[PDB]
UniProtKB/Swiss-Prot annotation:
This is Polypyrimidine tract-binding protein 1. GO terms for biological process: IRES-dependent viral translational initiation; mRNA processing; negative regulation of mRNA splicing, via spliceosome; negative regulation of muscle cell differentiation; negative regulation of neuron differentiation; negative regulation of RNA splicing; neurogenesis; positive regulation of calcineurin-NFAT signaling cascade. The modification Phosphoserine is found at residue 110. Keywords: Acetylation, Activator, Isopeptide bond, mRNA processing, mRNA splicing, Nucleus, Phosphoprotein, Repeat, Repressor, RNA-binding, Ubl conjugation. It comes from Homo sapiens. Signal peptide: none annotated. Residues 14-88, 131-206 form the RRM domain. GO terms for molecular function: mRNA binding; poly-pyrimidine tract binding; pre-mRNA binding; RNA binding. Monomer. Part of a ternary complex containing KHSRP, PTBP1, PTBP2 and HNRPH1. Interacts with RAVER1 and SFPQ. Interacts with IVNS1ABP (via BACK domain); the interaction is direct. The lineage of its organism: Eukaryota, Metazoa, Chordata, Craniata, Vertebrata. It is found in: Nucleus. One of its GO terms (cellular component) is nucleoplasm. The gene is PTBP1. Plays a role in pre-mRNA splicing and in the regulation of alternative splicing events. Activates exon skipping of its own pre-mRNA during muscle cell differentiation. Binds to the polypyrimidine tract of introns. May promote RNA looping when bound to two separate polypyrimidine tracts in the same pre-mRNA. May promote the binding of U2 snRNP to pre-mRNA. Cooperates with RAVER1 to modulate switching between mutually exclusive exons during maturation of the TPM1 pre-mRNA. Represses the splicing of MAPT/Tau exon 10.
C-alpha cells in the first residue's frame, strides 16, 4: 500500500550495522572510532563468529548515515565495506554466548566527544577520507617531537607535522594515506597519556 514517500517525520533511527567484515581485521575499537567521530557512538556490539556483521548503535539517522556515507568504500583495513542499517530500538545487554569477553560493550556518553554541543548538530569538522589527522589535548609536558614521535612509532608515513587554528594548544599531522592516518587514529584516540588527559584525534580539513 502507501509508500513512494516513507520518512522526514519519523526519519532517523540511530542503531546501525557494519557488514562485509573480513574476520580477523575487523575489531571492536576500530569500529567505535569511526562512528564516534562522524557522530557520537552510543553503544557497540559485534556478531563475533555469527553473521560477518557489527552492531554499531549510533547518535541518530543523519549520523549513522554519514558514517555509512564516509565508511562506504573507505576500505579501512581493506575490504569493500557495506556498513548499512537496522532501526533496532536500543541495545540492552543479551547473552552468555554474547557478553563474556566484550562482543558486547556499553559505551553510552563517552566523554572524548570533540562535538560537546549541548543540543546542536553543527557538523563543520568530520571530513571524508583524507591522510591529515587533527590532534588535541597536550598538557605543557610533551611537544610536537613527542606527538609526531607517536604517529612515527606506530609504523607511519608522517607527511607533515603542524599547530591548529590561530590559538595554538592543539596540533595537526599528516600521514601519507588514510589507510595509515586512519590506522594511526585508531592508535592514538584516547592514547592513555595519564590521569585521564588521554589523546583526542580525528580527520582535518587544514593542511600541510
Amino acid at each position: 500500500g502507501r509508500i513512494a514517500i516513507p520518512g522526514l517525520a519519523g526519519a532517523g533511527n540511530s542503531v546501525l550495522l557494519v557488514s562485509n567484515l573480513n574476520p580477523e581485521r575487523v575489531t571492536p575499537q576500530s569500529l567505535f572510532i569511526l562512528f564516534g567521530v562522524y557522530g557520537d557512538v552510543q553503544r557497540v556490539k559485534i556478531l563475533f563468529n555469527k553473521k560477518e556483521n557489527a552492531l554499531v548503535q549510533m547518535a541518530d539517522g543523519n549520523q549513522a548515515q554519514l558514517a555509512m556515507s564516509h565508511l562506504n568504500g573507505h576500505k579501512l583495513h581493506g575490504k569493500p565495506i557495506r556498513i548499512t542499517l537496522s532501526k533496532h530500538q536500543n541495545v540492552q545487554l543479551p547473552r552468555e554466548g554474547q557478553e563474556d569477553q566484550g562482543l558486547t560493550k556499553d559505551y553510552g556518553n563517552s566523554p572524548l566527544h570533540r562535538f560537546k554541543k549541548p543540543g546542536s548538530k553543527n557538523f563543520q569538522n568530520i571530513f571524508p577520507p583524507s591522510a591529515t589527522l587533527h590532534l588535541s589535548n597536550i598538557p605543557p609536558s610533551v611537544s610536537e617531537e613527542d606527538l609526531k614521535v607517536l604517529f612515527s612509532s606506530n609504523g607511519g608515513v608522517v607527511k607533515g607535522f603542524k599547530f591548529f587554528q590561530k590559538d595554538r594548544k592543539m596540533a595537526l599531522i599528516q600521514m601519507g594515506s588514510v589507510e595509515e592516518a586512519v590506522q594511526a587514529l585508531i592508535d592514538l584516540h584516547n592514547h592513555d597519556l595519564g590521569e585521564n588527559h588521554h589523546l583526542r584525534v580525528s580527520f582535518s580539513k587544514s593542511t600541510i
